[model samples]
Structure formats: structure tokens, C-alpha cells
Target: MEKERETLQAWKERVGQELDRVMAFWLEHSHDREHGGFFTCLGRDGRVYDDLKYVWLQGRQVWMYCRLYRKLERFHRPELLDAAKAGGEFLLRHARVAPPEKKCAFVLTRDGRPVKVQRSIFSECFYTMAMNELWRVTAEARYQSEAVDMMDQIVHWVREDPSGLGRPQLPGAVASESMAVPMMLLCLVEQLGEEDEELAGRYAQLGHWCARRILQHVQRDGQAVLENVSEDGEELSGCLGRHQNPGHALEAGWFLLRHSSRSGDAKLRAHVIDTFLLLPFRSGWDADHGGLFYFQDADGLCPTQLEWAMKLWWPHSEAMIAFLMGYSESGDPALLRLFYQVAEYTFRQFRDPEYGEWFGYLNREGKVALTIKGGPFKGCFHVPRCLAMCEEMLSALLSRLA
Candidate 1:
């Protein structure tokens, strides 16, 4: 028993070290002293490959810095807080391209000039999260109100108006449901609910709405969650709607699991674990290969996504959290076993022993697909978020073993 406890302690320490390594890589390479916000697209050896700024990546870095300062109390440093504030200030000045009525810009130049706009609302999502978390540290009502207002805008655009996304669809186009919007909205509500009493009711309503939308994607024919569905929640016939993204579903499962835990909805929690978590994991994992597939098809047909067979870093990160959270919540050894299986595969394939941080993409056979540390879509958010979450869980598990 003593030997087993020591092994657990060692594992916890190793995870903590990996978190530190990932943070160190970002802290050293990402910040721009001349430009203000972070430079997200970097080569494998921490070289900045692009000068364009992405709004979501900026918000994610700011949120990450603030989160560490808020959560890692003993090891907290003033530099992280300063970086967060600087990034937030830059975002405040440049994230929005249009006047108050328009959506936030998707891309910006090196000097914070707006470059382009996207139809997606994620730019605003991360902005809300960044400002809300910054409010916890600064206690400024401006940050809090801005965060709340941003969320309000997101809800308005998603629910009330279609123009918020920049334009309407073509004539006779069937409106489709996406897992990304509701999943993000639920996360935003949870983050805001922690500090604002006035928004508690709104949070609950949003939670319920998000829960229903996410759950609706779970197909009755098979347990896998479809990536796209009709506005009425029916699966579409084509590959676009028939696509199964296990990583996405696992990520959504944990987000909903967090909601269930907060609301004390045992039924929701169980459904998340039994259906949302288990189904994707079982269907998504490559039986021939070790890592989770990037995409699958509900009908067992070939996925339309060219990268469907490849494995990405974020899905494994999400699975690690889902399994650990399931184990933590239910005290199920089976969940813990799954957690270890994923951790072993992830740590072996993703972590770079020669360079720091992690590889973002891998081939179907687990070969390195992308050698970059960060890119247009990959940034500081998912990797660090996973590390931080896993470190917390491992610490708790270590205590139990001890």
C-alpha cells in the first residue's frame, strides 16, 4: 500500500511538471512586448510564424493567465497577472472591428488593427470568459458588466437574431444545429454564475437550454452524438450531418457534467457519463490504432472530413478530463481505469521529449502530423486547461491513496 501511494505521488508530480513546462513555453514565446497581445501561431521550436492576431486566442491567453493567478495561489506570480491585464487591455482596444452594433473581429494585425471578421461567435465567447475571469482579480465593475453584456450579445445573436453572425443563409437552406454554440454558452454561464448573484437565474435558464440542445444531438439509432443536426434535432442524410466527432462530444460531455454537478442534477450527470461520455469514447477510439480518431461516421461510412482518421491533441485532453471527472464523481474504478488508459496513450504520443509543450496533430498511426506548437486553431487554451484540470484531479487522487 505504501508503495502504491508513492507511485501515485510520483505520477501527480510528473503531471504538475508537464503543466509547468507547457506554461513556461507559452510564457517565454507567446507574449509580445512591442505588440501587447499574444502571438499565437508559433513553429515547433517556439518561433513566431505569423504576425496576425486571432481574437479567440487572445482571449484564451488572457483567461489562462488570470485563471492561474486565481487558482494557483501558492505558486502564483505577479508576472502572470500583469500579462493577463496587458492582454485584456489590448483585446479591449482591438477585438471589436465594427461599432457597438457589430460582432467582434476574427483577426487582427500584429499591431492590433482589425484584419478580417468571421461568421462564428467564438470571438465573443472567449472575450466574455477573459473579462469575467479578470474581474475576479481586479474587482472592477467594468470588466464584470462587459463580460455580462458580451454574453447577452451572444445569446441575442444565437437565439433572437441571425444577422449577428454577419449574414443570412441562402434561400431554402435548412438551418442546422451545431454542438459548439450551446456547449460554449453553457461554459460561459457556469463561469459567470460563480461570481454574479444577479445572473444566477439567467445562468440556470441558459444551462437548461444548453443541456437540451446538447442532449438532442445524441442519436437514437446509435449512441454516438452527431456533429450536425437539423434545427429540429434530426440527423441529416449527408456526411456533413452524419459526422461523429468523439473529441467534440467528450469535451461537451465534461462541460455538461460540470453543469450537472453544479445543479445537483443526478439524472443529467448519469446521462452525461453513461451516454455522452461512454458512447463517443467507445465509437471514437481507434481499435487498430491507439489514439482517438479525429472524426467518425454515424452510418459507418467514410467521413467527409479529410482529417477524420487523424488524432488531435484536444480530444485526448477532453477524454482525460471526462474520465477523471467521472471517476471523481462516481468513485467508479472503471472510470479510473479508462483515465489511465488515455493518460498512457496521450503522454506517450503527444508529449515532446526533445522540445517542450506538445505536438498538435498526429496521423492515424500516431505519427506526428503537425510539428507546430500553436496554430490558427490551436493555442494556449486546451493544453494548459487539460494540464491544470488533470493536476487538480491527480492531487486529489494522491491524497486519497495516501
Candidate 2:
């Protein structure tokens, strides 16, 4: 028990330090002093490479700040809450525009002018995240109301004959499923469930539906998680159909684990661990190198993604959380071994020693492939969240062991 306490305390401090360092990098460089909101396109040395703001990333930053303030009380400062407020206000002013239909823009100027809008619902997804978390901190009903409205819009889009994702159903083309949609939707549901129990209760069925859809990709024979599937959740033809993304599966696995635990479905939780969590980690890990691969093929075919062999930071982050969560829940030494196996490579490969934040991309051989810290997709979300979660869970485990 003493040894466990020592180990946990060390990790707790490490996670805290990394979280603070990463957030400081953003706090120093991301906030736009000249313009409102943040400058997300950042170089390796914490320099602003582009002044444009991505709507999804903007919401993610807001959510992250509010999350820290809301959960990490020991580290919470007035500046953290203030940053969330500033970003939330900016998003309210300039994140949405209606030309064809009222939708969130994909890109905006630093001062909040619309630059580009994608037909994807992800923009709105992050927008809801921002508003929901901001509402929690500020006690503002307006943000909550807007968040609920956005959730409704997202549900509508998903329930449509063809999703508003801008991809039209081509003739003879199989209407396939993507793990991303359900994965993100369940996340939104969990986010909402944090504050408003009544509203979340009403949306609970939607969460279950998403969980079911995600489980559809889990193969019965192989026990591997596929990235794309038929409309009915069976395997499709060709590479796109057989493609697997272990990172995405790990992320979805944790989401399912959380959901099942909450809904009192022990059987479902066991299924997730047996199929979703362990299988993907085995498939995703690059035995040749020391990191997780970006993509794979279920049938051992060449993965269609050019970055299939590349190691991206996000997958490793998700896998770390998944393995840690699995161990925490089951007290399985095997899960603990997997957790450190991922952490060993993850900390060694992705984290920048000279620089403050992590490099988002790495080659298959575990070399830094990107010099930028923030980009169109990468922001203050995954890395900071992972650190915070590890700290929280590790601290809890230590308390139990003590």
C-alpha cells in the first residue's frame, strides 16, 4: 500500500505538471490579444502560424477551460473561468451563420467572421459542448438554452433520411455507418447529463441508441472493431468497409464503458472490455515500433489511409484513458500492464521535451512528423483532457489502495 501510494502520488504530480504546462502553452499563445477568440494554428515553439479560428477547436478550448475550472478546483483560477467566458461570448457572436440553412461555420476569422462552413454536424457538436460547459460555470440559462437547441438540431440531422453531412447517397452505393458519428453523439449526451438530469433523462434513449450503433461495428468472429459498416451494421465490401481505426475504437470503448456503468448494464460493460477495449489495443499497437498506428485493415489488407502506419497523438491519448479505465474498473493486472505499455511509448514518442505541448503527428518509426502544436483538428482538447483524467483516476485509485 505504501508503494502504491508513492507510485500514484508520483503519477498524480506528473499528470498535473503536464496538464499545467500544456494549458500554459495555449494560455500564452492561443488567446488573441489583437483579435478576439484564439489563434489555433500554432507552430512547434508556441508561435501563432495562422490567425484563423476553427469553430470545433474554439468550442473545445472553451469546454476545456470550463472543465478545468469546474472539476479541478485546486488548480482553478479566475483566469481559467475568464478565458472560458471570453471564448463563449465570442462564439455566441460569430460562430453561426445562415446562408443555405443556419449552421455553424467550420472556420472563422480571428475577429469572428465566417470563413468556411462544412456540411458536417461536428461544428455544432463542439458548439454545444462549449455552451453546456460555459453554462455550468457562469450559471447562465442562455447558454444552456442554446446548447439544448443545438442538440436538437444535431438529432434532427442524424434522424434525417440522408444525414446533413453533405455526403449524398450515391446510386448503388452502400449506405455505410461510421463510428465517429455515434461516438461523438454519445459524448454530447454524457456532457449534457452532467448538469441537467431531467433533460439528460429525456435524451437517455438517444445515448443508448448511439451505444448500440457503436457496438454494431464489433465483429462476432474476429472480435475486432471495424471503422465502417453497412447500414445494418454488417461488414461492407472493399477497404473502406474493412478499415479499422484502433484509436477511434478505444475512444468508443471507453464511452460505452461509461454508459454501461451508468445504465447498470454489467453484461454490456463486460462485452466492451472483452471486445472493444483489448482487441483494438492489440490491433492498433505498432509492434514494429513503439506507438499506435493510425489505421488498420480488419482482414490484414493494406489500409487505405495514407497515414495508416503513422502514429497520431489522439489515438494514443484515447488508448491510455481506455486502458487505465479498464484497469480501474476490473482491477486486472493485464489491463494495468497495457496501460503502462501505452504510456511508455506515448510519453517517449509524442511529448516534446524542448517544446511545451505535444506534437500531434509522428511517423511510424516514432519520429516527430509535425512541428505544429495546434491545427485544424488538433487543439487544447485531447492532450490536456487525457492528463487531467489520468490524474483524477490515478488519485482515486491511490486513495482506494491506501
Candidate 3:
């Protein structure tokens, strides 16, 4: 009964410890032995139904495990390192459709065969991130080379000539940009340039370009954050331009904040909080119910996506990070209040108190819509990431208060 009432310090410790429990589920259940990679599809009770290996999540799992191994003192164990290496090697063997070219398959079979190929830059992004992360964990120069080479090809595909991506160039398809691309590119910049000064300087050009590119999503006299914009950042027509992915914009806030912190740009920091954090929360948060709606229309019209009204774990998780990050940076009491508001609502709804991990999908009224713990889209990334990040930020705040 008393567990319901806890202090901020207590909350900090609880999530700090929760990271291990969440990670234990992945370490124990998701390991693929013969395939030598990790599995993403797991039932509620840690059961494996399908053995398909989605390269995006596979790379993410590798990066997550490698991330913990490298950064956290307690998680630097042989088991975690071994798992990361196995996944990295598995991706090396089977992730790419063609070895000579860097076009990776979106999904691979249980026995290392290409199952599906999605024509986009996401698979390669995660793949490059995974390789660089493996390099960080193992100090293997080969992994660095693989990561750098793929990043070069990915950059070429995105900007120079997308001919390598092989899009049909349909007549009706409009040329535009999704906020996620620049976001991912900048994230890769931060990921690869963590501690290495030379590499960080080398990638500053790409990072700055992507940073400006991300800013273009703010349109409608800076009142709305659109999802897709024309090549020159003009708002497009119809639903594509009207779509508002609050979760993505929320993710961008922290990214921009982090970038601003890196560049020591104080003005950009405030702008980030206003447009990305406060604006998204104002429009995105479901008022009658709680938690952020997955997508909304800019004009308050009928949301285009079917699950637009549904609450999702990703948006909530990102909100937890974004709002808390806002508080930490600005030290505004309102930011802290918003953080707890989202944090409490998130803890109440998404957590699997009975099982170990979390449920990904929630209906509008905050009911569980999906039961699977890990899937192709939901892996060991977001939940533990939010937990780990919040835990770190809370610890920082606690120490500062003391």
C-alpha cells in the first residue's frame, strides 16, 4: 500500500534498478543460437513464435547491448559483450543483400537468408550504428571500417544520388522530406562521434547540415510542426503536409537540445523547448484520456492514420525523455511538472507489472492493445532506453539538489 507514495529519489532508484530487470528479459529470451543473432519477436511470456530477424531491430539490439556495455560500469560483463559481438557478426554475415554494395535487407531468415528488402535508409542507419557500437565495445578496427564505409554509402544514397536506392520514381509521388531522416542522420553523427575528436570533426559537416534540415519542419508561422515538407521546407498540400507526428517531434527536441548543448548555442535550446517540446505536448497529449496520441492533424481535423487516436509506448517513452530533458536543461518548474505528469501516466499504463517487459500498443482510453513484449518494431531499444536515460538524468538532478 505504501509503495504508491514515493519520493523523487525513490523514483530514481526504482527505475535505475528496473533497467536491469528489463534487460534481463532480452538477454535470457532473445538470444538466437544457431543464427548467431538475437530474435525480436517474443510472446508475452518469453516465448518465440517466429524466427525472422529484422535488420533494423537486430542492429538496434546490438547497439543497445553494446551501449550498456560501453557506458555503464555495472553492465560491462563478458556475457553482454559476447551477445553484442554475436549480433554484430550475424549482421555482417547476413544483413546486407549484396556484400559489395551496402544495400541491406530489411529482414533475414532464421538461417541467414534475405526475406524482405525495404528500399530506405533506416536499415543501413541501424546497421552502421551497430557496427560502430561493436567497435566501441570490442576495440576491433574492422568494425570501425565497416561502419564508416556503410555510412559513406548511406550519405551518398541520401544526398548525392538516390539511384542506388532503386525507388521506382512513380509519376504521382511527390518529392519531400520526412523529419526522421535528418533526425537519424544527426543521431548517427552523435553516436559515431561520442568520444573520438577526429571523427567528430570529420562528421561535423553532415551533422550541421542535418541540424538545419531538421529545423525546416517548423512551418505555419512557427505555430505547427509538420511531418513532411517539400524539398525547400515549404508546407505541402493535403494530409501528408498536415500530418503531425508528435512522438517524432518530441524525439527531435532532445536531439536538438543535445546538439545545441554540443554547439553551446543557448538560443537554439530555448527554441527547441518551445517548438518541439511545448508545442507537441500542447497538441499531442490526449486530454480526456492520458498519454500522447501517436499522430494528429495540424488543423484538428480527422487524423489520417487509423491508429491516430491510439496511445503508443514509443511516444510516451520519448515524452518521458524529452520532458525530463527539458526540465534538466532549463530548470523550469513547469518542465519538471510536465515530466512527472507524463511519467506518472506512462508508469500507470504501459508497464507489464505481471510480466517483465512492457506492452507496446495502447488504445485511446489507455487499454492494452498489443500483448507481445518484443516485435519487429518494438525491441530492447525504447523501453530500456527511456528507463536508462531517465535514471541517469534523475541521478544527476538528485546529486545537484544535494
Q: CA lDDT of each candidate?
A: 0.86, 0.86, 0.88
Tens digits of lDDT, candidate 3, 217-317: 99887788999998899998888979998999999989988877767666888888999999999989888997898989998889878999999888888
- Model 3 gets an lDDT of 0.88
- Writing each residue's lDDT as its tens digit, candidate 2 over 1-402 gives 795577568777887898889988988888875556777899999898888899999999999999998899865888888877888888888888774454889999888889998877888899999999999988999999989998988988887633565666679887787999888899999989986789789899999999999999988575778889887999887988888898998899888877777765667777898788888887778888877789898888888778899999999999889888888887887987887788777888888888798999998998888889999989989999999999899988988898
TM-score of every model?
0.96, 0.96, 0.97
* lDDT by residue for model 1 (1-402), tens: 486567556767877888889899999999998879999899899999997889999999999989988887744788888888889989888898875764788899989888988888899999999999889999988988889888999999889986768676788766898898899998898888885687867678877898889888988654779988888989877777787889989999888888788677777677788877788888889999888999898889988788989989999989988998888787777887788889889889998877788998999999999899998888889988988888888788778866
TM-score, candidate 2, is 0.96
Stretches off by above 4 angstroms in model 3 are: 1-6
> With candidate 3 superimposed using the best TM-score fit, by how many Å does residue 23's alpha carbon deviate from the native?
0.5
Most accurate candidate by lDDT: 3
Identify the leading candidate in terms of TM-score.
3
User: Regarding TM-score, does 2 or 3 come out ahead?
Assistant: 3
The residue-level lDDT of candidate 3 at 297 comes to 92
User: Could you tell me the lDDT of residue 393 within candidate 3?
Assistant: 87
